[PDB]
Homo-oligomer: A and B are copies of this chain.
Amino acid sequence: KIKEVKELLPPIAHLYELPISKEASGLVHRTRQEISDLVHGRDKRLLVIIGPCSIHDPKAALEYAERLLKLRKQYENELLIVMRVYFEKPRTTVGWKGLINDPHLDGTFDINFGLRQARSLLLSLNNMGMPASTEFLDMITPQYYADLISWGAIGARTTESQVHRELASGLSCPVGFKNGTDGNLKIAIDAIGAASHSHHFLGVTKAGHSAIVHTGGNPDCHVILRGGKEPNYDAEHVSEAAEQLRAAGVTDKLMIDCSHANSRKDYTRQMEVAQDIAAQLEQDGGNIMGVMVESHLVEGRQDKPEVYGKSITDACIGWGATEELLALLAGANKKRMARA
């Protein structure tokens, strides 16, 4: 039941063509620290992971980045803005898995090219001053570009998975674990516990050979509230999450996803969620360290990549709505930071 096995270039090949620049290296290292500070309550800025549900077009992604960069800089004292640069998508059943798996968007599975494109995009983003985030779904691909990533997500469908927790335990960036598809938070709390410890498992080296990897633990993990059978973004759900986190002795600072099961897949509700968060930040909101927003140049979605700057996976808010949502959150958090 295996059709074929094909030639794969090892990470060192891509690392040779596209070595990390000093300026990229500095941004990554820096943003990781900054985020770690948010995770552990040492800085009260709000982390904002924002951008497309998935990258299908580097040029659009670069243009998006350039716009977002101005706002990253403008709001830098209230918000820590990092771009969503997602290359791997977990499907409910089957479908396009992302740019790495099939970069020509036609069923050709040109993975060598996909991995090259993903590294290239990430390098250009970091070079221009925009840090990047992604969902780490595969066990092997991260060796190809993890060095360019400032923050990582483990998805709702894999938070419970031991191999994903293992993976997170060895990543050098902070990591967010989503609650489960039906709303189970415990699995994410458990995942932080697990990922913070040392693990031994089989992995693949930068030279494309299998090996035993021994990780040191990732101390910068946190939970992401992304809704379930019902939304879990409000104050009450946040307060209950926080108590459970303190109970298991892990960080009670969390991220709230404005999209997915919290917006019920209606991109026009992301603003409502952000409005609720804004209010929580104004009243108290002490347990919130970040938010997640799926955002693009052009709002909505499409099945085929016909329109530029428009998602082919989950529907996104457009650029206008994005400017508004960011100003809303910046304003709200400026007040939270002023209180102490």
Q: How many copies does the complex hold?
A: 4
Binary contact readout A1-43 vs B (1 if CB under 8 angstroms, 0 otherwise): 1111111111011001100000000000000000000000000
Q: Is A269 an interface residue (CB 8 A)?
A: no
Instruction: Please give the number of chain A residues whose Cβ is less than 8 angstroms from any Cβ of chain B in the complex.
Output: 70
Contact A208 B205 (CB under 8 A): no
The answer for the CA separation of A90 and B91 in the assembled complex, in Å, is 23
Q: Is A264 an interface residue (CB 8 A)?
A: no
Q: Is A63 an interface residue (CB 8 A)?
A: no
Which listed residue, B137, B182, B197, touches A180 by the CB 8 Å rule? B182
The answer for the CA separation of A296 and B141 in the assembled complex, in Å, is 40
Q: Is A97 an interface residue (CB 8 A)?
A: yes
Q: Is A217 an interface residue (CB 8 A)?
A: yes
Q: Is A138 an interface residue (CB 8 A)?
A: yes
- State the Cβ distance, A303 to closest chain B Cβ, in Å: 19
Q: Is A283 an interface residue (CB 8 A)?
A: no
Which listed residue, B6, B184, B193, B210, touches A93 by the CB 8 Å rule? B193
Contact A213 B94 (CB under 8 A): no
Instruction: Mark the stretch among A47-55, A77-85, A158-166, A255-263 that contacts chain B.
Output: A158-166
**Dominant secondary structure of chain A at its interface with chain B:** loop
* Neighbouring B residues of A204 by C-beta, 8 Å: 140, 204, 210
**Contacts A10-B10, A13-B12, A93-B193 known; A163 to B137 CB distance under 8 Å?**
yes
The answer for the CA separation of A174 and B109 in the assembled complex, in Å, is 26
* Neighbouring B residues of A187 by C-beta, 8 Å: 181
**Contacts A13-B16, A141-B202, A170-B1 known; A94 to B214 CB distance under 8 Å?**
no
Which listed residue, B1, B17, B201, touches A171 by the CB 8 Å rule? B1
A196-223: which residues lie under 8 A (CB-CB) from chain B? Answer: 197-198, 200-218
* Neighbouring B residues of A5 by C-beta, 8 Å: 203, 205, 211-214
- State the Cβ distance, A259 to closest chain B Cβ, in Å: 19
- State the Cβ distance, A96 to closest chain B Cβ, in Å: 11
A240-286: which residues lie under 8 A (CB-CB) from chain B? Answer: none
- State the Cβ distance, A86 to closest chain B Cβ, in Å: 14
- State the Cβ distance, A152 to closest chain B Cβ, in Å: 12
* Neighbouring B residues of A328 by C-beta, 8 Å: none
* Neighbouring B residues of A90 by C-beta, 8 Å: 161-162
- State the Cβ distance, A15 to closest chain B Cβ, in Å: 9
* Neighbouring B residues of A102 by C-beta, 8 Å: 200
A–B complex contacts, Cβ < 8 Å, 5 sampled: A2-B214, A138-B201, A160-B181, A182-B182, A207-B208
Residues of A near any B CB (own CB < 8 A): 1-10, 12-13, 16-17, 90-94, 97, 101-102, 109, 111-112, 137-141, 157-158, 160-164, 169-172, 180-182, 184, 187, 190, 193-194, 197-198, 200-218
